[PDB]
């Protein structure tokens, strides 16, 4: 508790440095048709022509990702549940509160940009997406970080890397289908995530230095709970298994898979020097061995899962007018 107050100066010098000043930040308008341009109408027209060459399954993944981004208020609330770092007034001048608010401000651009791209595309049912967003924010999320900044920051380090990987992959696909402007959208959001992930990972690195036992134990606890996706409760008013189905599509398309999850786990183990730690408590060594260790186990389970996998299985999605895509 006092550790985070004692780390305030450190955070100003080591965490806040990863924020881009508002003056130097990209904005959604940089990547959208310019509504004051004499060419606005043509720019929208061109966006729509490019979108016609993008298949439905990519739009399912892109919409799921946009909906996740749009639930931002949920995520700021999560960070603000964490003892030691939470903003106690809404304007607290602590390094930690300044970070939460500025991170949230950067994140807000992601949902904005993807929303308007999707709106202009004409390839998706915006009303059904809007319904899904309302259900999602109403449902919240249950990632089990409790009131722990250890859990919160470990979870966020993991999940920002996951979204970085997802967006980079989505950019690659956008470029594949001939849509450079959508590739740039995904690339810009991905660059935010790389930076955010680096910042959160740095915080946990410092915590591991000051208290290796508490940190490794929290890492193991989070991994046992599993890194639950932020929009795990998504629902559109018709598909009670919407998240499972969206996730299946995202996997098949190569945007995000169980193997990426394993890669992130092993990345963080390395970055926090978890395998190389020594002089831990009995509980600490148990946690160390568990996380070390978990990666290869999940990778083998995934390999066996792929081995026994039967043929999917096409599914309607309200987001694309009940048109069907392969699971």
Ligand X SMILES: CC(C)(C)C[C@@H](O)CC(=O)O
As annotated, the active-site residues are: 26, 69, 107, 110, 160, 163, 192-193, 196
Buried-state track 84-100, b at ≥16 Cβ within 10 A, e below 16: bbbbeeeeeebbbbbbb
In terms of phi and psi (left: phi > 0; alpha: psi -120 to 50; beta: otherwise), the region of 273 is left
The one of Na ion, a copy of itself, ligand X, none whose footprint includes residue 138, by CB under 5 to 8 A per kind, is: a copy of itself
Strand residue runs (E) in 223-318: 314-317
Token duo for residue 189? 């959001």
Token duo for residue 7? 């780390």
Regarding 111 and contact with Na ion (CB under 5 A), the answer is yes
Beta bridge partners of 314: 326
Among 231, 233, 274, 291, binds a copy of itself (CB under 8 A): 233
CB atoms within 10 A of CB 72: 18
Closest residue to ligand X, based on beta-carbon distance: 159
Regarding 206 and contact with a copy of itself (CB under 8 A), the answer is no
Residue 47 vs 67, nearer CB to ligand X: 67
Place of tokens 């991905």: 190
* 326: three-class secondary structure by DSSP: strand
Contact residues toward Fe ion (CB under 5 A) are 69, 107, 110, 193, 196
Contact residues toward a copy of itself (CB under 8 A) are 22-23, 25, 27-30, 32, 35-36, 40-41, 44-45, 70, 72-78, 80-81, 86-92, 97-98, 101-102, 104-106, 108-109, 112, 115-116, 119-122, 125-127, 130-131, 133-144, 146-147, 233, 237, 321
Contact residues toward ligand X (CB under 6 A) are 69, 75, 78, 107, 110, 155-156, 159-160, 163, 230
């Amino acid at each position: 508790l006092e550790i985070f107050k004692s780390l305030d100066d450190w955070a100003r010098n080591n965490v806040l440095i990863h924020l881009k000043s508002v003056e130097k930040s990209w904005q959604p308008q940089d990547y959208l048709p310019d509504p004051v341009s004499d060419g606005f109408e043509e720019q929208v027209r061109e966006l729509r022509e490019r979108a016609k060459e993008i298949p439905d399954d990519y739009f399912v993944v892109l919409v799921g990702d946009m909906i996740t981004e749009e639930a931002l208020p949920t995520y700021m609330s999560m960070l603000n549940r964490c003892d030691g770092i939470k903003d106690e007034t809404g304007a607290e001048p602590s390094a930690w509160a300044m970070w939460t608010r500025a991170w949230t401000a950067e994140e807000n651009r992601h949902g904005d940009l993807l929303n308007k791209y999707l709106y202009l595309s004409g390839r998706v049912d915006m009303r059904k997406i809007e319904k899904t967003i309302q259900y999602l924010i109403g449902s919240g999320m249950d990632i089990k970080s409790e009131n722990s900044p250890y859990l919160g920051f470990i979870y966020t380090s993991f999940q920002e890397r996951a979204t970085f990987i997802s967006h980079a992959n989505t950019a690659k696909l956008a470029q594949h289908y001939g849509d450079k402007k959508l590739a740039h959208i995904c690339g810009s959001i991905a660059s935010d995530e790389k930076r955010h992930a680096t910042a959160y990972t740095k915080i946990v690195e410092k915590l591991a230095e000051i208290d290796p036992d508490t940190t490794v134990i929290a890492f193991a606890d989070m991994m046992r709970k599993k890194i639950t996706m932020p929009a795990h409760l998504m629902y559109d008013g018709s598909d009670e298994l919407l998240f499972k189905h969206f996730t299946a599509v995202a996997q098949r398309l190569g945007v995000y898979s169980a193997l990426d999850y394993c890669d992130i786990l092993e990345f963080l183990v390395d970055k926090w020097n978890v395998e190389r730690l020594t002089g831990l408590s009995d509980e600490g060594r148990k946690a160390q061995e568990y996380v070390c260790e978990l990666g290869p186990k999940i990778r083998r389970l995934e390999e066996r899962a792929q081995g026994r996998a039967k043929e999917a299985p096409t599914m309607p999605f309200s987001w694309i007018f009940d048109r069907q895509v392969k699971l």
